[PDB]
């Protein structure tokens, strides 16, 4: 914390200001009062987001506006606080965003196999995962071709070292394959990245917040392929990641895991995912103890990994604001209060 | 490459400090005999200027660290942009220290005759100048970036809650006595050193 | 050379016309060593010339 | 070259008219410029000249164009998918299908026969009917190639089940081999059979603990009527009603149970099972490559036909007149490709017009770049006089 407001001053005390944007309880729960999208327009005009639906005027306004305008703002804030970024932040800010960019190319490259069309396989894409050839992906079908094509110039080249092409075009089988080994590979290079050049105080807390999204894509993998997939235990160990809390033991047995049960008493072993999968909603699990591992890393202040745990709150902000106007305008309200407020 | 040179120069020092001590000139080694034959007035302007020196490089350190995160923190709360500004002022006393001791230890920097130059009080007025300037503005330092840091955590908890900046204030209370007692102690260390006769 | 050699080998398998262009640089690489070699032999010309 | 590798007779086919002259060899005929003049006078130049057919109009020789550009494609997908199944199996060579006999003649020797072949075509028929015909006969035949291929993988997986449980390991080996009535029960209204597998360490445990382990079992019925590698195989006797009890308390020892019980007909329908596998799959395999042969033979027929035709027409809609066209296909060396390739260019180039004129020469085989290769299908060059490299 001695050398870090150097180029890192102006950056956190304005992340820091817009941490204080979060919604608290009591903002939520006055949100869960409204009657329609219009009421919950004006009662989010008074917290940070003021004004951000002005543009609309009570009749176009849709539970899935406001989440694209809410997570806009958000990504015009992130190109703020990345515009004013220099250094080993600027490329702390950029692998942030290889794992939208990761996101972006597999449902681009979706969209071409069931020949819908570009201009609208391209606005469900993420803003921050943009580069310049993302809509180039429409090119070809094979992995090879849009590899030597197009995803060399990009900074997802390095991530293509173990995508095997046996010259079998695309499936909607193998791009999940494609995207999980993609996002192995990311999570490997941006944990190795955090260990070698951030600095300590934001080193610790950020490999906790990186070993988190690693082990539940970890679970997430191992549990999706019970249903839509059949695969070899030696051919989907490539897509648990290696760096996290859970791999050395776990995902071993979550690799040969055959049933649920396998899952389960696999998960029973590690001390802070045991009880997950016993009851409730494991999404809401997932997304708590996000919540709970981003609360405290604003409490360590001179750290880059409040970036991080601010976009992470910020975008459970606003699918929190999301559930609650699809609730309001739906008019189901026996699970409004599903939301996950730890600020 | 920087490792290197650190071993290098180790290396070097081993080597020398073994050759000049196995054949029987070990003595030649002599930093006493340095010290009793420098001129005091290098320990004396050393100290006066490197007071002055590092005083500041600590003032000016911690007014960078609590002033980037006050102008980051004031942007979505700009009422902080000037209550807050006694951070600056507390990693900033601590260049006011270090210039007032300065200036005292310069009236004790007089032209001493030629024959009583490398004398007991002489000698001794350079070693504690020295020394004395040392422990102010290494004090300062460490004490104006102690008061930036806990200025700039101030800074955010200020425009988090209005009512955190009383709180975090005597945390930076606490973090300034240090230059003040540094002020103390380099007074009294230089405050039996006469001038130099 | 090596920085040369390395850039130029793995472009000039995509490009058949760059290899009398990685000739070319690197006969500038070579003759910096080539000076150095005229140097040494001007110098070793003089080391006994007129020594007592 | 070195940027490519070639071992096989590699094509170039062109079409000129008739009144052309190569201005990189003034005071020379084309025809006889290919076999003195062209690569160091190593061309073998052959044969290739078709008659003409029937064209519908001026009007319809675009819409002919447009689509033997497609067929061609179509018809060039199903020869490298045959030839990739050939080779990749590996019971016929795959140091041929490049240079491999059509008809029991040499390639280059089979296309300087090549004048127009008759199988089912005839130059007394449209061009739109040929154009339809011949790619009908190609799709059918390599959907048959493709089916058997589909069909000879099904039965790998059957024959690989099979097998397993004719002698594996014991998590879904099912029991046939073993077919006594000293190790197994049958016609019995008290008594069944459970097999237990058993870890070779444990074997001991086993034996031991098994009469007390569940109540009411058949002592002296350890007996090994298997083993594999990893694992014991014992049958049990014991009563219907203690089956649930024996499965239960053998987990908790760390032995896994394998629910299998003696009926004679499961027992027959494991065997035959094992049979049927072995016997499509081996069928399979010899009528998958006789099948491939002969349909490579006829899809190689039909192809160049496509080519001929193609090369034929393409030069009548740029070059009108003469109505016959002087076609001729090269057969070029290994490794003098890229030479070859050259001197076309600069010599017939001029015929198609400055404008038609561009440079980008030379060829990546490599995923580097996308230049510097030439098709009349991109905008990005184009071909200066109507030229066909073809690679097998």
Known sequence: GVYFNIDNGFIEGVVRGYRNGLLSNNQYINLTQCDTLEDLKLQLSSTDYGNFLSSVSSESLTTSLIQEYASSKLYHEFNYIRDQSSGSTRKFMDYITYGYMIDNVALMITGTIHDRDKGEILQRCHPLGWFDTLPTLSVATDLESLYETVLVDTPLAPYFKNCFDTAEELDDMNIEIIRNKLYKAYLEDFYNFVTEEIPEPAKECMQTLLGFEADRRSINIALNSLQSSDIDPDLKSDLLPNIGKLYPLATFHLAQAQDFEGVRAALANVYEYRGFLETGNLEDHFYQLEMELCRDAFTQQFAISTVWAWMKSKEQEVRNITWIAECIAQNQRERINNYISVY | ?197 | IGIVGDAGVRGSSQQPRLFVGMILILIFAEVLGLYGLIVALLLNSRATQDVV | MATALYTANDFILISLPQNAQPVTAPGSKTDSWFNETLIGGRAFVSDFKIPEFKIGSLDTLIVESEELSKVDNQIGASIGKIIEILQGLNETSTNAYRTLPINNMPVPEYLENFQWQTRKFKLDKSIKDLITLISNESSQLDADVRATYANYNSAKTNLAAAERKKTGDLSVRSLHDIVKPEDFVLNSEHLTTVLVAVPKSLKSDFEKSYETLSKNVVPASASVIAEDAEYVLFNVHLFKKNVQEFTTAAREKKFIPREFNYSEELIDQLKKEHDSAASLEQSLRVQLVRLAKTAYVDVFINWFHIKALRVYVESVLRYGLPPHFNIKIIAVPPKNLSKCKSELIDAFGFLGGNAFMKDKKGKINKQDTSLHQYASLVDTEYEPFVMYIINL
């Open chain 2, 1 to 197: 490459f920087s490792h290197f040179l650190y071993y290098l120069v180790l290396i070097v020092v081993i080597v020398y400090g073994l050759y000049k001590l196995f054949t029987g000139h070990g003595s030649d080694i002599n930093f006493g005999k340095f010290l009793l034959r420098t001129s005091p007035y290098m320990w004396a302007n050393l100290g006066i200027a490197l007071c002055v020196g590092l005083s500041v490089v600590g003032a000016a350190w911690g007014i960078f660290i609590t002033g980037s995160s006050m102008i980051g923190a004031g942007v979505r709360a700009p009422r902080i942009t000037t209550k807050n500004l006694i951070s600056i002022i507390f990693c900033e006393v601590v260049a006011i220290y270090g210039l007032i001791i300065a200036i005292v230890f310069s009236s004790k920097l007089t032209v001493a005759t030629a024959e009583n130059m490398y004398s007991k009080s002489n000698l001794y007025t350079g070693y504690s100048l020295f020394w004395a300037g040392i422990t102010v503005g290494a004090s300062n330092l460490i004490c104006g970036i102690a008061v930036g840091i806990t200025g700039a955590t101030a800074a955010i908890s200020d425009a988090a809650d209005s009512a955190l900046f009383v709180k975090i204030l005597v945390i930076e209370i606490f973090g300034s006595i240090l230059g003040l007692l540094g002020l103390i102690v380099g007074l009294l260390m230089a405050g039996k050193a006469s001038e130099f006769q």
